[PDB]
């Protein structure tokens, strides 16, 4: 019966909670209490990218750590040479309501999407010397919140129809559909081995998905509001989520638990973007208070503040070599911090 | 100093800057209207009058003014996650069916369609992103409401109604019950029309209201207001 299955579900949730509490001998703060703090972290704006004429909604770094793509709602996706502040490309979008952008690991493609329900794949290296739309992926029935390349031929998108999808680009069809979220999936993050990906939605829960099997392996709760951002730890065994209740949280995959909460009393605004440093010691988070906060990820102390934007810090990224942090904001200026 | 290819890349970047600035100057001369309404509220009729999945963008030029209309009716997802994308629109065109004062919602019974439209208008008008964004309100199907009001009194919808069962008193009552949901009466203004079937009398009203909004934005830019 319905009621019997609901009772079984409640029993299994109690079992999961008891098994999580059983292997919770010590907290992360009880072991990291003896290591040295990182001290005051001061990063100065090195490069300001003055090319966007409207709110920037996403940015992604290239693998080479020099080029960065940035998407704004003026209809322009701009590829930037961050060393010289040059403009390598400016791509006019068919729909100007772009909410995400991705840069392929090979560097040959970029992607974007948004309120048009379509993920557009743009080829950068053509014989004609311009950037053309190589593909348009349709099939999502809500706004497309986050996209990330696996390789040249495979992409993972997360939309506002409570689903994620793994697409084969050259056919244009969803290879896999990931269902299970009951709210708008707002972000995703790929593991370094690109076999598992986590996704945070608007039901205050994150889920870990196996790309190959298309099934949800673990569900992580603990937030009290919409999860607007998520990012793996660099070894792939943990991740951090940013939410609307002014807290970041560090969850562990193998222990199936929240490890750390990053929150301060003087912080009430919501997190829109999280990222780690190269070693994972720093956790950077963009907030709606127009400022970025750098947290000691092992000690939950606010190590530093990146305060250089006049509007909400909408997007944030750290290079592969860890040399710089790029923040993009609603006041149209990307800034490179170091 | 720079090499030859570095100088040519800088020249490429400056040409890209010029094209971006020209495209921004072209895009800043266009009027963006966010189209909003309830289910089956006559949004489609409004779109057809203006012309003559995801975002449905409409383009129409009137009196050498270029209007872009963004219909977001197919977004079944939560509204508060994408509504801030439309913070810089010129105006919000809200469509309300006047013949919904007796109908009930097909999704949920015991909830009036007119009350649901009033709740949606309350959510949009007093939202924190539209603190100073004016609202053009359209009250569709006035002939249907005229026919229905004689047979069916308005007091099933609004139990505080005291006026007569005529078209004009009931229509002005519904207009007042929609206009008084504006909390920020000083910073934003509500323009109301009754969706006349006559050609170039609805898009004429949109042109007049957008001209008023442009004059008020220019006054706030010059420091006079």
């Amino acid at each position: 019966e319905l009621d019997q299955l609901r009772q079984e579900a409640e029993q299994l949730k109690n079992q999961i909670r008891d098994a999580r509490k059983a292997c919770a001998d010590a907290t992360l703060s009880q072991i990291t209490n003896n290591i040295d703090p990182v001290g005051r972290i001061q990063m100065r704006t090195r490069r300001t990218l003055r090319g966007h004429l409207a709110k920037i909604y996403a940015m992604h770094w290239g693998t080479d750590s020099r080029l960065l793509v940035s998407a704004s709602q003026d209809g322009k996706l701009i590829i930037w040479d961050s060393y010289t502040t040059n403009k390598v490309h400016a791509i006019p979008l068919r729909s100007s309501w772009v909410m995400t952008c991705a840069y392929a690991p090979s560097g040959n493609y970029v992607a974007c999407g948004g309120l048009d329900n379509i993920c557009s794949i743009y080829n950068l290296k053509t014989r004609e010397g311009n950037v053309r739309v190589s593909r348009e992926l349709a099939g999502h029935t809500g706004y497309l919140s986050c996209c990330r390349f696996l390789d040249d031929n495979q992409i993972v998108t997360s939309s506002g129809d409570t689903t994620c999808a793994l697409w084969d680009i050259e056919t244009g069809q969803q290879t896999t559909t990931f269902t299970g979220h009951t709210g708008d999936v707002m972000s995703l993050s790929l593991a370094p081995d690109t076999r598992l990906f986590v996704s945070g939605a608007c039901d205050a829960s994150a889920k870990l998905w196996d790309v190959r099997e298309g099934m949800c392996r673990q569900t992580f709760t603990g937030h009290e509001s919409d999860i607007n951002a998520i990012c793996f730890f660099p070894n792939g065994n943990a991740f951090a989520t940013g939410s609307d209740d002014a807290t970041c949280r560090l969850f562990d995959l193998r222990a199936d638990q929240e490890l750390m909460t990053y929150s301060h009393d003087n912080i009430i605004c919501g997190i829109t973007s999280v990222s780690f440093s190269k070693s994972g010691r720093l956790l950077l988070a963009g907030y709606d208070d127009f400022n970025c906060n750098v947290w000691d990820a092992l000690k939950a102390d606010r190590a530093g503040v990146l305060a250089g934007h006049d509007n909400r810090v909408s997007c944030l990224g750290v290079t592969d070599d860890g040399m710089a942090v790029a923040t993009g904001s609603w006041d149209s200026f990307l800034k490179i911090w170091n | 100093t720079l090499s030859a290819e570095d100088k040519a890349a800088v020249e490429r970047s400056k040409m890209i800057d010029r094209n971006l600035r020209e495209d921004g100057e072209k895009a800043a001369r266009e009027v963006k209207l966010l189209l909003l309404g309830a289910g089956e509220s006559g949004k489609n009729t409004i779109v057809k009058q203006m012309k003559i999945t995801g975002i449905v963008e409409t383009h129409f030029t009137f009196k050498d003014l270029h209007f872009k209309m963004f219909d977001v009716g197919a977004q079944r997802s939560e509204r508060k996650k994408w509504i801030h994308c439309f913070e810089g629109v010129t105006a919000i065109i809200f469509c309300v069916a006047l013949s919904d004062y007796d109908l009930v919602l097909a999704e949920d019974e015991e909830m009036n369609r007119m009350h649901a439209s009033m709740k949606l208008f309350d959510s949009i008008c007093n939202n924190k992103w539209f603190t100073d964004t004016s609202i053009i309100l359209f009250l569709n199907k006035k002939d249907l409401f005229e026919e229905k009001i004689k047979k069916s009194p308005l007091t099933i919808c609004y139990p505080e109604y005291a006026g007569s069962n005529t078209y004009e008193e009931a229509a002005a009552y519904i207009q007042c019950q929609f206009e008084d949901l504006n909390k920020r009466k000083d910073t934003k203004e509500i323009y109301t029309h009754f969706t006349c079937s006559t050609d170039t009398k609805n898009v004429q009203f949109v042109f007049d209201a957008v001209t008023d909004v442009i004059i008020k934005n220019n006054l706030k830019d010059c420091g006079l207001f």
Partner: single-chain antibody
Amino acid sequence: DVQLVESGGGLVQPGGSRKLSCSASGFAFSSFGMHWVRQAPEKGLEWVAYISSGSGTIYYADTVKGRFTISRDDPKNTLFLQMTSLRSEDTAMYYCVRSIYYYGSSPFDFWGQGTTLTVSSGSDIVMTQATSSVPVTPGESVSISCRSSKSLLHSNGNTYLYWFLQRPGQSPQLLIYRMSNLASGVPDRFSGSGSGTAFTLTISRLEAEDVGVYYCMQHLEYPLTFGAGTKLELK
């Protein structure tokens, strides 16, 4: 399909004038810088002129400075070289070359077929290809050496060395751009390695297609200068 077609050549009396046209089809012409590169009938390539995308910067070789004028018309996708007071030194096969410049771009990647012009009767970087002929056998690995007078390694890490191949009867073709980067559509076997001033181009497992004249070009400073060219023959 990308094509540059040159027209306007012929026999011109000395002191005369002639206008060359290059019609471009199959690519976004207004975003490519364009070069004119002539070739004497028994001698190596020589750079003539360059106009940028958007016609901002125009450079000429010292030989043709004042006499020649390069211009472009972007809506008609056409490139003009107006030549006045032609001497007998301007007898050459002229090539229209496209080149785009951004981070990681490949300049000098496509060359037109060329038009034939027959005229009847100090601080420039010297690029040196010491050997002029290396007889090779198919299936072998050969090295082509090129020495520069001034070091081509810039302070930004890029060494602006460009290796081109001209098969017999065809236009030159880009093989290596910026010392080590293999051009698009070029086979794996070609590989460039350089040390500031001395550069080598290695062709392992040589094939019949590979025979022809190889030129090294610098791009560090204008005027762009080519080597004399090293010729690979059969047997």
